[PDB]
Design a protein around this ligand. Structure first.
Ligand SMILES: C[S@@+](CC[C@H](N)C(=O)[O-])C[C@H]1O[C@@H](n2cnc3c(N)ncnc32)[C@H](O)[C@@H]1O
Length: 199
């Protein structure tokens, strides 16, 4: 339902900008990668996840690894996505996350999605699934800070519109699209490749 919408958001973005090198950080069961490989613009498609069990002309590679460690094999990418990841990082990792993804990796575009804790109406269905949840203001102040620090511009959108009678208090999933200002523009191998294929 909503995960479908998130994936389709990313697919639409890929169709629009045709990135050649795409990485999904916190890729989970690799569903998003499976969807994106459809598009022939992509020449390199990479997934990274700390959960090894979930991972068990075109090159596709899956790495067991953490978003807060610098691996040089993820340098020079066109698009990096972090879909529903940041709300599972503890304060330390959250603090390190931008210096690695924006500072070190420095891709042309980054997409970050996270729940809008203010979403109206809250659908009854747990909060204990993740570490934290952010309001729109919390996400946007964080995202603007990161944007200004690393010389990206950030566009806010999301997926999952309020149902027709509800007061609009944002999308269910809030999304920041970060674009490197000006556009494009030693080996540190840390990740362990779990799977790779090329053809
Ligand atoms: C809520 S799931 C999102 C999965 C996928 N992105 C999606 O939208 O379907 C969060 C994922 O992030 C992974 N993860 C959590 N911390 C991570 C870290 N520090 N480095 C890489 N992956 C991490 C988890 O194992 C999990 O697969």
């Amino acid at each position: 339902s909503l995960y479908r919408q998130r994936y389709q958001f990313v697919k639409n973005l890929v169709d629009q900008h045709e990135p050649k090198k795409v990485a999904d950080l916190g890729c989970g069961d690799t569903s998003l990668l499976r969807l994106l490989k459809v598009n022939p613009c992509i020449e390199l498609l990479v997934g990274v996840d700390i959960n090894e069990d979930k991972l068990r002309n075109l090159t596709i590679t899956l790495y067991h690894g953490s978003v807060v460690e610098r691996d040089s094999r993820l340098l020079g990418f066109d698009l990096i996505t972090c879909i529903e990841l940041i709300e599972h990082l503890d304060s330390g990792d959250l603090a390190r996350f931008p210096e690695v993804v924006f500072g070190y990796l420095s891709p042309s575009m980054i997409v970050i999605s996270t729940p809008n804790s203010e979403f109206n109406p809250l659908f009854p269905s747990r909060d204990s699934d993740h570490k934290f949840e952010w309001t729109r203001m919390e996400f946007q102040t964080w995202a603007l800070y990161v944007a200004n620090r690393y010389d990206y511009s950030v566009e806010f959108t999301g997926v999952g519109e309020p149902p027709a009678g509800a007061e609009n208090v944002g999308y269910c999933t809030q999304i920041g699209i970060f674009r490197k200002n000006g556009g494009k523009a030693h080996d540190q191998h840390v990740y362990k490749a779990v799977f790779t294929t090329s053809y």
